[PDB]
Design a protein around this ligand. Structure first.
Ligand SMILES: N[C@@H](CCCC[NH3+])C(=O)O
Ligand SMILES: N[C@@H](CCCC[NH3+])C(=O)O
Ligand SMILES: C[C@@H](O)[C@H](N)C(=O)O
Ligand SMILES: C[C@@H](O)[C@H](N)C(=O)O
Ligand SMILES: C[C@@H](O)[C@H](N)C(=O)O
Ligand SMILES: C[C@@H](O)[C@H](N)C(=O)O
Lengths: 156, 397, 397, 156
């Protein structure tokens, strides 16, 4: 209820796409996102964690209007490159803490995860930038999550 | 138009240097501009005075230290007023307390609370150039204070906000903020304009000369910031708010920590990062992808100096919460493209991944922002990735 | 009681030196004394700052010169506050503006108009030692000002007057004020007490160390003044208000001018000295005896540097008002006995003339005050006259 | 009245004694003032200007009660040492400017002589000290002189 931030931002118009068990070799990220880009679908969030036993998972987000289109291109790519599956979700929201301060990522992110945890909001994705910490949650909890974050932090 | 200019220690390091600063300032005034100049102590005075106090005590008294160290800028403000008046341009010097830069009570680290525009506005309308002492102020009780490092920069930006200046000009050694580090890409080129948000996302441009806090302050108050080389070789870079990508940023001082097979339940992310924060370990990147079979992986990045501390802490957490393992790697580099317009254009990330794949560079992690894509790769590829992306995005010169 | 102490540049010349004054102050404060300390800039600082300004300009801007030179004392007040705190005695530094020493606008030569006692009185009642920067204040408009030479001495006495302190202590190299110059009389003795009036009458005992203006000021406000060696070898001398003769004073740098056969009519005295005053010749002695046959003689004394100027002015007047001649002599010395109680007793002047007569010294001129007798003698006799009088009056003691 | 001084002092209890044409040789001031001191007569002002043709004049002042005693002693001394004559005056006053400032004798004295000259007050004697300028005048003019000095000067 004291930490300082510029604001809390969110986006309800987002759809999640994940291709799981993709081979961890150069050129794959381009094979996944190349055809999405070729279709002119805009991409917002992209998340990839470390490979384990030579496969990794690759997730990105698109505007809700492009979900079905991106899903089918990703599903066709998933079969082409031997990935395990391609899965999609439309019932998500992206909420972010902005104006974070570069040296302080560990503090504000600790508080944000704490605030979400008090309510029982499960975090599905986490991404970071120099001035932002971003979270992906189920869409229905958005209002509770924003209210929790407004209490947890101090707006500048 | 009204302009605020700040001159660093080197710029005002000698009388000869001050005379030069005056000559330039003369040119702006001659052009129809009202000028407010912020100056720092001549070179060596701030360190010399601090050294005089530590000579007295190991932890010198903060309140008394401020009145010592603050004098350096007061010498400087007078000389430049004299060198200006000598050159036929009227000038008035201002103490921190004279303008009234009201501040915190945190003695060697005070923050600006309020700036009175009334006295300066009168001097400007009378046609005089206002020379303000950087890095000082006073608290509500009349005690002298110092701002801390980059204090002068802060003062200049704070003066620009309170006076609603057209722009604040920071004079330094560099000609501007470049597309990437010219030491790494010799074809890097100077930028004409970038947003505050872009400049903050390319942190490594942030350095000793321009303090990050200064960029931060101007953004809160929409203060146009210009960084230029002291002698006006060029226009410098204008940082304000409004080329597929602006620039390429990188960090070689990174180490990654991953905890695997973490139970996917609320509160677990707090358990992973909470103890890291308690230890004062700086964290840069945090990445978590979607769970599978109710477990996921959690990764974050720290400076190499704190790598093993963070790793032993994480191994403890992995034991506490029942995760599969905690593992770390120090042989990584972070490479990023930043630029607005990433938001309005498809395919920017595609082109970055293709250019890395042409060079046989494997991508280990991806993290993002609306205006940024960050990649973690094996450290050996850092310069090659930076060059690959630099030609690919057509920033070469 | 409340004591004001002033330490000059040599006393605070180095950090090591500053540390001892603090020990000195500690002793007083521990004795139950509230202490106000006024300090000067560290050695060489004031001259170093001025020379830095002459570097910029031939005639440096007075108002801006004030802003630069004033900083020197501001460094010193903090160091002594820090050196006092370390020793365990609480202290606060005061800039001139903080106490609120309001002054005049004559920038390099400002005069004190008013001193606020409220904030200092508060710090003293809180039990802290207040360290004030000497030699500075601010005019009614907020401009920084410097007192001029001897400014710190002035500041300490002004604080002593405004605070109604019990006494003001001036620390310097000398042990006190002596019976006569020890160089001339090795048997000279340190005086315990003399009045302001005696001290002013012995003008040569006033060196750069103790500005005469400072003694004048203390006199107008009955501020007891003590002059001591910085290391308290002894009680020093106390100068306050209230032994046959206190001391013997002399001046070797004199020249006598006499205009003879002047018409004894109102206005002629104005005609003789008016033009001397117009030329800015400083005059010491003026002697005129009773007229005879409606003419008299008019004599005055000037510094040897002004002799030829004064003589040629006088000749012109002698011509204008019809005098018989104007003559000058540079081969003279002035010797004086000063002492209160001279008023009370008969025969003091008799004893002075007898002592000079025992030595074959011819008295050429005599001038008087209630507490002084002055004689003008041949220059060669100066030391002998002083010695003869010093023993005649039993000052060898 | 621009000059600053501490104040204007005057003494009405004074008597002037002059011995004229006294040989200008050492010991003579002692021979004149030695017996006066022996009679225990207090002396205030003593004024002697430079000798001319080996003789000088010597003037001093005493309290009015002692005038007659001092006058006769001086008259006997004048006869003893070969002086030309001894003369006395009772109708005089002493007026002084005090708080002068050693630096300014030329300025304050110029102004005092001018204020007295604008009235037609003739100055008969002038003597000086570091902090005082003193004048002797006919007693009848004391009031006029003091008012003139007050007008011409600024006090503290
Ligand atoms: N849509 C991306 C550009 C690159 C994506 C390639 N599929 C962006 O705005 O970052
Ligand atoms: N009162 C002393 C001194 C007089 C000369 C100076 N006022 C005396 O009678 O000897
Ligand atoms: C995993 C995927 O990112 C692959 N490493 C690539 O380089 O495209
Ligand atoms: C995995 C971790 O992020 C958990 N889902 C949480 O909400 O804290
Ligand atoms: C001689 C001179 O002093 C003259 N008596 C005067 O009153 O000015
Ligand atoms: C005249 C008197 O002054 C004499 N010259 C003396 O020396 O005593």
């Amino acid at each position: 209820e004291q930490p300082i931030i510029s604001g809390i931002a969110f986006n309800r118009d987002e759809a999640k796409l994940t291709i799981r068990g993709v081979p961890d070799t150069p050129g794959v990220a381009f094979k996944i996102l190349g055809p999405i880009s070729a279709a002119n679908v805009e991409v917002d969030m992209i998340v990839q964690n470390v490979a384990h036993d030579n496969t990794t998972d690759f997730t990105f987000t698109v505007h809700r209007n492009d979900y079905l289109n991106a899903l089918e291109i990703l599903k066709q790519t998933a079969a082409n490159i031997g990935a395990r599956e391609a899965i999609g979700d439309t019932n998500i929201a992206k909420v972010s803490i902005v104006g974070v301060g570069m040296r302080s990522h560990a503090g504000v992110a600790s508080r944000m995860f704490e605030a979400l945890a008090k309510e029982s909001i499960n975090i599905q994705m986490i991404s970071t930038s120099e001035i932002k910490v971003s979270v992906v949650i189920e869409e229905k909890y958005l209002e509770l999550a924003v209210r929790a974050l407004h209490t947890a932090f101090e707006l500048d | 138009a009204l302009i605020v200019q700040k001159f660093g220690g080197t710029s005002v390091g000698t009388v000869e240097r001050i005379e030069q600063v005056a000559e330039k300032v003369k040119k702006f005034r001659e052009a129809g501009d009202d000028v407010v100049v912020v100056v720092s102590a001549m070179s060596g005075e701030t360190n010399r005075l601090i050294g005089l106090a530590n000579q007295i005590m190991e932890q010198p008294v903060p309140r008394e230290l401020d009145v010592m160290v603050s004098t350096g800028e007061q010498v400087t403000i007078a000389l430049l007023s004299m060198a200006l008046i000598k050159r036929g341009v009227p000038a008035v010097s201002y103490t921190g307390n004279q303008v009234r830069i009201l501040t915190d009570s945190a003695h060697t680290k005070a923050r600006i609370l309020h700036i009175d525009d009334t006295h300066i506005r009168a001097d400007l309308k009378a046609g005089r150039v206002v020379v303000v002492a950087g890095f000082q102020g006073v608290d509500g009780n009349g005690n002298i204070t110092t701002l801390g490092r980059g204090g002068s920069d802060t003062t200049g930006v704070a003066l620009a906000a309170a006076l609603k200046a057209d722009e604040c000009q920071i004079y330094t050694d560099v000609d501007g903020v470049y597309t990437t580090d010219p030491r790494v890409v010799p074809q890097a080129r100077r930028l004409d304009k970038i947003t505050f948000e872009e400049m903050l996302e390319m942190a490594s441009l942030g350095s000793k000369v321009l303090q990050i806090r200064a960029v931060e302050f101007a953004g809160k108050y929409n203060v146009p910031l210009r960084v230029l080389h002291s002698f006006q070789e060029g226009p410098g870079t204008l940082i304000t708010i409004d080329p597929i990508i602006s620039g390429i940023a990188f960090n070689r001082d990174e180490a990654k920590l991953t905890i695997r097979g973490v139970p996917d339940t609320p509160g677990v992310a707090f358990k992973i990062l909470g103890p890291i924060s308690a230890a004062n370990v700086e964290v840069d990147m945090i990445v978590q992808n979607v769970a599978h079979d109710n477990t996921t992986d959690f990764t974050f990045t720290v400076h190499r100096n704190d790598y093993l501390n963070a790793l032993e802490i994480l191994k403890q957490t992995a034991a506490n919460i029942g995760a599969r393992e905690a593992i770390g790697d120090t042989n990584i580099a972070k490479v990023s493209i930043v630029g607005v317009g990433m938001r309005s254009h498809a395919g920017v990330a595609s082109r970055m991944f293709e250019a890395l794949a042409k060079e046989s560079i494997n991508i280990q992690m991806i993290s993002t922002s609306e205006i940024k894509v960050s990649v973690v790769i094996e450290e050996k590829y850092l310069e090659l990735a930076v060059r690959a992306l630099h030609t690919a995005f057509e920033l070469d010169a």
